[PDB]
Ligand binder design. Structure first.
Ligand SMILES: O=C(O)C[C@H]1C=CC(=O)O1
Ligand SMILES: O=C(O)C[C@H]1C=CC(=O)O1
Ligand SMILES: O=C(O)C[C@H]1C=CC(=O)O1
Ligand SMILES: O=C(O)C[C@H]1C=CC(=O)O1
Ligand SMILES: [Mg+2]
Ligand SMILES: [Mg+2]
Ligand SMILES: [Mg+2]
Ligand SMILES: [Mg+2]
Lengths: 371, 371, 371, 371
């Protein structure tokens, strides 16, 4: 085919971050991305990104294993295939490859980028058409210090950078974590929306009490308070919690979205291209949530500009994202591999109408930071 | 915008059929279509079709009211809008217009046709990319006579036209309808798949027995045996019936698909663009079904070539249609408004790769049959 | 520590098989194992095995990615740790590594082997004590030809090798697969137990009928007929099926076992060390099943002698394995890396009381077949 | 066998306590233990303990009937059996003896002690390996006087003996018991965790109100508020109670643990070797709880040092005991039969790495207190 895939190169890139990022299960000291360079017979190159958090501390795919599986199994299946038929290409992978959603997400992102350049259309238009040009972007406070977090949030407000804050908790004693969250919301008052993410850290026995306290203290959303494995517990917590509960880790594929909606495990779903298998699969998960009356949140696995924009282009097509987005990955990185970073201003991420993902590689940064 | 919608004309067309088509609630003596001609500033015209069965005997929208609502409410909302952004256009309609899925389906079909011509791509590619070029097509036997039906099916087999037969029942006494179906399957044996559609005609009290008899006599699928209103009954029948049950009328929007899947009301879903609001909405319903492990069937409201191809292009992108399709509408019509009819041969409908819906109007037929 | 782990080497070994093995999603032409060589400060070496089927066609871990993740993440965490405290070592991995059960299984197997040699006890005794010395072993028929399968089963009976047969179906047309299974059971009659494994291939719409037919034709067990994602469907099938349903792919961790038991998704559970994270985790899954009144089956991912014996030693401690085992992996391989193969005779696998896994490496075979 | 069991002697020992211990159904004025002395052919003696509370006021086994059933049924089954294969020995008992979990617990404890001495390993290592050397120990306040309880708790805090307090209620008027608990928590404030145990005393009609009041007054956990027989009620209370509910009496075997988890009867499970049938069975119950996302608590039936250490060794292997333990039995006894008592300091019980249960009998105390 004139648009046959000729090569797929995966590159692991280690990039510095602006500060330690403390999650319940892991403390980030930097970030590692897997860049995908997909080249086609018509001379077009598509760029994609597969990124996770903390090696294997978050999910079963590491940047290392993502490269291994793409090089050994994905490339052989796609090289020679028509790059202009994305649905057929991704279904070809689906029939021979189980799981590996992070790898698939990066691959589809690259195909979409190339197809966008091929047709001279931004990805958002390839996916149906945008209904907005900007997306609201929350900011995560996870320094591990209450005083530092409050100061940081106040500055982001003054800079008109962020007005929605996500607090990482679950690593310490429940009451200390609760006091921490309450103190932050008290300091910010009505000037900002404060939410929390427990990253599955709590047992239902703890969550049933903690959610009541948070809801009674101005916390707007409680993300994945308990293990995705306590299916019945998540359903019960949705009933006892006065604050809405959002599912994140509970979604590891489109089918999980349906089952969670069927069971009533959460009233809001985080949408992550890495967890669903790319922008298109993520839109199917969004369709399921919408059909069930479940709110949407534009999630991230802390991707750099490529993965962030791939996510953004899909979100631009959604009717509504009631709970906004957390597409701040590029801002946590002190250095990224894009020639021009995404545009952030006035509490939003602004997406252009340039072809594909509307970005280009910074060859110097790639050369220095690639492993 | 360069692709602004300049006009939308709705035309009611009354066309002759090859023979009376007897459904449980109505007997068709002909067919009426609503043609949509959408013209854009860049000189491109998109064609769409909104068609139903028996006036108001099947659904709440008649060809007459579809024209009324499109002319009075849809056109005012779309004229002047960018035709190249289909998602924004359909969402604009969704925010101001409740229901009217048949009208919406015709409108989106026209927009897709125009966009396909605009980019020089068939609709199937606009929707992501085809994974097949042909679709298996079933045939409905509904003459009202057992001997006639058997003869007709045998001929369709000999002509290599159809090998899957759908039998319309529910208008007569249950046992007489059952004998009718059993006699047909007995005569055809393993040379064909025989299924039935009761069009909601039976009460659960009757269906619980009838489904057992049909399943025990070689009937492969039982379509909408009871009222969509007996929600609990459909769930119970899925358990007592040895033959799979398919939901059709139970789906009147994407959200219904989710609720039916949540409740376990059917193991197979019929996919109709008219019932969901167009090809794109139908793909969302398909995504929900797939995520729930529910089989897919390419349904029809007996549309002519335009509506049939709009449906076909969407179905070409589905990973699998386990229960095939019933896209035979153009074959039931003795006359259609296409210059070249869809290609049917060797038990399938063959879809080309021509731009848009790959069709053109027969001006002479349109002029003579338009109301 | 005196028993500190000094090194962990992972070796990918490609071995020939006796014949093509056709599963619903993949056709095996050979087999690849990941050998784990764990050496301790006290001069003891423990051997473990992490093996899967068809690259990524079966699960999300490939032999390639298993090596990548063990070398990059597991080794760093364990080197220097006390090898004699297996629970602490495996929990150390669990707190930093998500998923990767296949890798974990191989690691724990190696630790158990080393600990057995260290104490001069077979693994079965380290795990509590055996209650049997032999395990019944089924045989899978998957040549893709009915005549060939019947002949093969008859020979295994005559050789007193196997009397329980597992038939792989789901790749072809349902009725053809059903005829295939029925013909085999008809030919063998009461001389053997015939079961099937659909490897998630069927939709519930198909399974609800197929299970009835199989149960009515002498088929003793139906393994994973539908997708693990159709949670509600598996529960419904357990009620409509006259033949017991066994969960396999539905179990990807110990927690899944609990949820399946809670929901009533299957009446029998396959026990696979690779799917649970090693012999010890598998015994926890067995404990859950037993507590729920669910039958046990000793499963396999087609491991060679090392993985097969690691599985066997755990199964020797179970009170009862009502549905026997399928520990025939070493028999499907024309060549393995053990100096002395496991002992198979009179329909059983016979496990010795030698220290650890009671095996040693064949250096010549390892050298020739290692990648 | 070289390690054949040659004799099993059961000895009832009546020991003085430090003060009356008032439970909802009984007031303890002393404590009675059943010591098990199991001697093997290799000259090794294993010690075990089967102890309950208040004769038959708590459970169906009394110290008297435990001795009767062990002497008449257990001994005959085990004498002559290989003591080094604990799993086979306990399964041999399970196939011929129904219930009698207290007796079984003492027997397995003795076998583990002997096996530990045989291999020169502490029981915790026989069970897989410890992940901690110390266990947090709560203290029960049950003098029947509010002023006395507050003073006692304050002293235990000052002595760095205990900082978690369990209050026995249910014997008096609900409001008086509630005032009692609230006054104690008020006096201790944040310096201690206060929990209650109602020992099944309340009717659901009372519990639904009382749990709300306790949860709203700083009470951290509510143990078995109602009858284990009101299965549906326990499930309902888990939803209405703002404080987590723990199941104790509801667990009388491993299977009960599964059923309670399936039904959602409690969010925390008390782990008692006497109620499950020994350390090993208790670890299976813990595995079920963990798989269900249910918190763990190290429970006691007020055993002396032998039974307390048997429990402790098992708990040392658990990944996490979110709700700590109540292994204070030896502290309630003014006299025990151990030559050296367990080590309690700085809010914890410290377990050594000595072989077996790491203890020896005080021949003088045994001689004087044995019945
Ligand atoms: O929250 C997660 O699970 C992943 C990621 C999203 C933002 C962030 O701070 O971490
Ligand atoms: O069956 C329906 O409900 C509508 C239509 C589909 C084919 C047919 O014969 O009628
Ligand atoms: O059946 C599976 O899923 C895996 C494996 C077990 C035996 C066999 O033939 O394949
Ligand atoms: O609470 C029980 O049911 C039994 C025991 C545990 C400690 C205590 O004080 O009594
Ligand atoms: Mg999260
Ligand atoms: Mg119908
Ligand atoms: Mg299987
Ligand atoms: Mg209690």
């Amino acid at each position: 085919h004139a648009s046959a895939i000729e090569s797929i190169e995966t590159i692991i890139v280690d990039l510095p971050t602006i500060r330690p990022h403390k999650l319940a299960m892991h403390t980030m000291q930097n970030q590692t991305l897997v860049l995908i360079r997909l080249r086609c017979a018509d001379g077009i190159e598509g760029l994609g990104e597969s990124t996770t958090i903390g090696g294997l501390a978050y999910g079963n795919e590491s940047p290392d294993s993502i490269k291994t599986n793409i090089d050994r199994f994905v490339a052989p299946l796609l090289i020679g295939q028509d790059a202009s038929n994305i649905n057929a290409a991704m279904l070809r992978l689906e029939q021979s490859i189980r799981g590996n959603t992070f790898a698939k997400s990066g691959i589809e992102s690259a195909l979409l980028d190339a197809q966008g350049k091929r047709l001279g259309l931004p990805v958002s238009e390839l996916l149906g058409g945008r209904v907005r040009d900007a997306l609201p972007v929350a900011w995560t406070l996870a320094s591990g210090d209450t005083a530092k977090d409050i100061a940081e949030a106040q500055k982001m407000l003054d800079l008109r950078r962020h007005r929605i804050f996500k607090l990482k908790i679950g690593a310490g004693e429940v009451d200390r974590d609760l006091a921490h969250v309450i103190a932050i919301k008290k300091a910010l008052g009505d000037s900002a929306s404060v939410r929390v993410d427990v990253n599955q850290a709590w047992d239902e026995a703890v969550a049933l009490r903690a959610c009541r306290i948070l809801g009674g203290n101005g916390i707007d959303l409680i993300e994945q308070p308990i293990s995705r494995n306590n299916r019945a517990g998540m359903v019960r917590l949705n009933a006892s919690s006065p604050a809405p509960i959002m599912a994140d880790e509970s979604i590891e594929c489109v089918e999980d979205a349906f089952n969670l909606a069927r069971e009533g495990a959460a009233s809001v779903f985080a949408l992550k291209i890495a967890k669903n298998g790319g922008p298109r699969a993520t839109l199917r998960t969004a369709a399921i949530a919408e059909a069930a009356g479940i709110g949407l949140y534009g999630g991230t696995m802390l991707e750099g500009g490529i993965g962030t924009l791939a996510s953004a282009h899909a979100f631009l097509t959604l009717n509504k994202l009631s709970w906004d987005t957390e597409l701040f990955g590029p801002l946590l990185l002190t250095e990224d591999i894009l020639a021009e970073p995404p545009v952030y201003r006035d509490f939003h991420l602004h997406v252009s109408k340039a072809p594909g993902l509307g970005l280009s590689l910074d060859e110097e940064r790639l050369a220095f930071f690639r492993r």
